[PDB]
Amino acid sequence: APLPDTPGAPFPAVANFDRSGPYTVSSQSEGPSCRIYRPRDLGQGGVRHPVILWGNGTGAGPSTYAGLLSHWASHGFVVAAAETSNAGTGREMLACLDYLVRENDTPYGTYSGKLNTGRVGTSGHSQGGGGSIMAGQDTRVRTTAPIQPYTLGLGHDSASQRRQQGPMFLMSGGGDTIAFPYLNAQPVYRRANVPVFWGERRYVSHFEPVGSGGAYRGPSTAWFRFQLMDDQDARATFYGAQCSLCTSLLWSVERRGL
Numbered sequence: 001a002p003l004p005d006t007p008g009a010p011f012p013a014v015a016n017f018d019r020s021g022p023y024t025v026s027s028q029s030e031g032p033s034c035r036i037y038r039p040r041d042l043g044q045g046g047v048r049h050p051v052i053l054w055g056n057g058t059g060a061g062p063s064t065y066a067g068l069l070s071h072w073a074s075h076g077f078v079v080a081a082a083e084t085s086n087a088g089t090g091r092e093m094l095a096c097l098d099y100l101v102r103e104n105d106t107p108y109g110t111y112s113g114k115l116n117t118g119r120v121g122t123s124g125h126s127q128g129g130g131g132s133i134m135a136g137q138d139t140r141v142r143t144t145a146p147i148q149p150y151t152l153g154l155g156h157d158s159a160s161q162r163r164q165q166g167p168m169f170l171m172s173g174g175g176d177t178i179a180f181p182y183l184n185a186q187p188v189y190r191r192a193n194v195p196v197f198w199g200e201r202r203y204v205s206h207f208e209p210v211g212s213g214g215a216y217r218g219p220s221t222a223w224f225r226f227q228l229m230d231d232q233d234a235r236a237t238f239y240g241a242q243c244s245l246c247t248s249l250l251w252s253v254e255r256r257g258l
Helices: 062-075 091-105 127-135 158-162 186-191 214-229 232-237
Strands: 025-030 034-039 049-055 078-082 115-126 143-149 168-173 196-201 251-256
Touching: 025 062, 034 062, 034 091, 049 062, 049 091, 049 127, 049 214, 062 078, 062 214, 078 091, 091 115, 091 127, 115 127, 115 214, 127 143, 127 158, 143 214, 158 186, 168 186, 168 214, 186 196, 196 214, 214 232
Parallel strands: 049 078, 049 115, 115 143, 143 168, 168 196
Antiparallel strands: 025 034, 034 078, 196 251
């Protein structure tokens, strides 16, 4: 850990990060209480799929975010969402990683030889966004993208903010009165020991990520494509003084080490 980077053929390019990708998707509950959203046909054309671990919002289940999870899977990601409605410690998210790792390496299953376990990301909404930070401490994790994280309690260890392994895309909502950004997101940005891109979407509430992922679906996808798939087309969304988010009137950007 990190696990070796084992890339396959390059992933098809897409013209929009917020539209579906080329793959037909499926989901199943399997492993240690994991709901996995993935391309129906794994390894099409020789691609090796990067992994995204997902933590739900407090009291929610994977289906609450089915539109977002499937969307990522349509791009070519295998998304392992912990089934738990309380994912703040990040432990259940990582149990799902342990299962995929094992499955990839075994000779005869669904995922055998199909994953790129050297390319792992974490994300989550609210308590699960705190859970993605906590899991981002694992050396197997290359990047995190917490969506409106709740970091004031519900299993969060603020020490984890200074022990990240890769770059973070921190997302907050200007109208979130449940995981108030100044109290839950600003401290994460302040303390991050890795390059951080903090995008605050003005006006949106704590329910914006539920379902299709709303305004966070495209940006989050561009982030994972760039970090996990080396998609250079997604690069400009976050890099440069003129990156897309940077010039958008609906996002407040704060960047560091990038």
